Design a protein around this nucleic acid. Structure first.
Ligand SMILES: [Ca+2]
Ligand SMILES: [Ca+2]
Ligand SMILES: [Ca+2]
Ligand SMILES: [Ca+2]
Ligand SMILES: [Ca+2]
Ligand SMILES: [Ca+2]
Lengths: 150, 146, 150, 146
DNA sequence: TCGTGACATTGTCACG
DNA sequence: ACGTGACAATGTCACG
DNA sequence: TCGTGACATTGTCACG
DNA sequence: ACGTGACAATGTCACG
């Protein structure tokens, strides 16, 4: 259980979630007849500032087929809300070319590491360790001295 | 370089106005609520009919929004025709801010694209293994002779 | 307890031990007066074939100062009598030069091994293992091939 | 090459006869017990006097024994003058029959003395270590470079 | 006591 | 007739 | 339920 | 005026 969830803000989250889905053409309520449907959506609107009210509206009006989706959306908001306090916990999306993504995904599977982790590997193994041509030479130089004339 | 099928495009254009309106934005370039709403109310009826949409746009849409709508719509075209073939389509990936930085900075330097750089990191490293699987095998033949 | 000691032969051993020491000028008996001394030695002589008799003669006449020495001599006879059945158990004495003995004794101390064992070491380490000049060469021959051009 | 001090030597000679007699040997070159014993009885009285011993020997000692006495006495001289200095004295050592053989055969081959051979075995081997403490140190410097 | 290894003493032989 | 190496047989002693 | 990582969709910007 | 890379913000889903 990483994050503290205070209903006041979480509640406000769903309120906006609901109101938004409604504006995008979705049956927020669980009422089969349009009459009561619009009669419930109108009450949801005037619940803007009241947090205790929303949770109730959900219990007696929200479309049950929204439940899981709303939870999953609220879980994202929580994590993102907290992970936003600092930058190192913040995520950044980088949409790159297919063929490229694929070649990068393969490694993530042939190493079992995370994408964001595999990207770090390539940054180190290549940028930090660059002296394997000379090592091949010098090592023979030293061996030559002991294994031959001195 | 993409074909802009005004029929489909006029669609996107419609939704954008609607959507923006339904979000509380100024779809009109007026002041009062009278002629304002009337514009919208009329735009709503342009559902199936495209040729009439543009008509409304040119005579009502807020100049402010017009700027954005252009980019937005222009953006849809690219993505639209891109998803017509999987290899021409880009996929989004997430990175830990720190991980993103190391990569971003690295690319901004070489001047190449994020995707470009990534491709580089893969080869630069798998080229190094050419040595790891090199000096390691030699040292193994060395101890074996003893 | 390695060897079986049957009084009959052991007894005969001491009988000869005693009789011998007497002939070499030693007070076999524990009798202070020569009179009884010769009177005891004469009885010992006629005990030649009788084994049970000897052990008794020892108990009432033998010089106590002979005890330990006789035991130590009899312990040698036992071991030697048995160890004589076969050759590999038989010992062989080799008197060699001082300076030589010394150099050989040193090794026996710097290895904590037995003389007869140290002599075996020298026979093996020198006679059996004679190929350390070529090994120094060939080993470089092989290393040269892998560590250089092939 | 040793000096044979007849005085001391005549001593050894005396004891030998006595001892041999006391062991049941024929100290005389006779047949019957009469003149035989009388010879001995007389020899016993030659205790302190040496010059008289030889006298008896030449006229009584068994020819058979005379052969041995010679070697025996001649053997004492060597040992006697040898023990006058520790480095000139030899010390006896025991070996397991098998161990003795390996050494004996080895020497009978090179034609040299047991003591000689032993000296050889020591050097031949400590010369080998010149390599054991050689190739071992090189192989240790070899792995260290890796 | 016991077994054992390291020596020691004495006597022969054989060989050079 | 010798000096000598190699034994064989025997006895002690100090260990463990 | 929860946290999480992998994606996806949409909308802007800025730049060439 | 466009195609485009880079985001930001948001939503889902399948894991464990
Ligand atoms: Ca000891
Ligand atoms: Ca010989
Ligand atoms: Ca023991
Ligand atoms: Ca997953
Ligand atoms: Ca850019
Ligand atoms: Ca988890």
């Amino acid at each position: 259980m990483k994050y503290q969830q205070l209903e006041n803000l979480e509640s406000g989250w769903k309120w906006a979630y609901l109101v938004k889905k409604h504006r995008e053409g979705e049956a927020i309520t669980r009422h089969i007849e349009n009459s009561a449907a619009q009669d419930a959506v109108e009450q949801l609107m005037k619940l803007e500032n009241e947090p205790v009210k929303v949770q109730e509206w959900i219990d007696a009006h929200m479309n049950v087929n929204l439940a899981t989706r709303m939870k999953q959306t609220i879980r994202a908001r929580r994590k993102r809300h907290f992970n936003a306090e600092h930058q190192h916990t913040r995520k950044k999306s980088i949409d790159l070319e297919f063929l490229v993504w694929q070649r990068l995904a393969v490694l993530a599977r042939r190493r079992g590491n995370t994408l964001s982790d595999t990207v770090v590997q390539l940054i180190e193994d290549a940028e930090r360790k660059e002296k394997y041509a000379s090592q091949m030479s010098s090592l023979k130089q030293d061996l030559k001295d002991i294994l031959d004339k001195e």
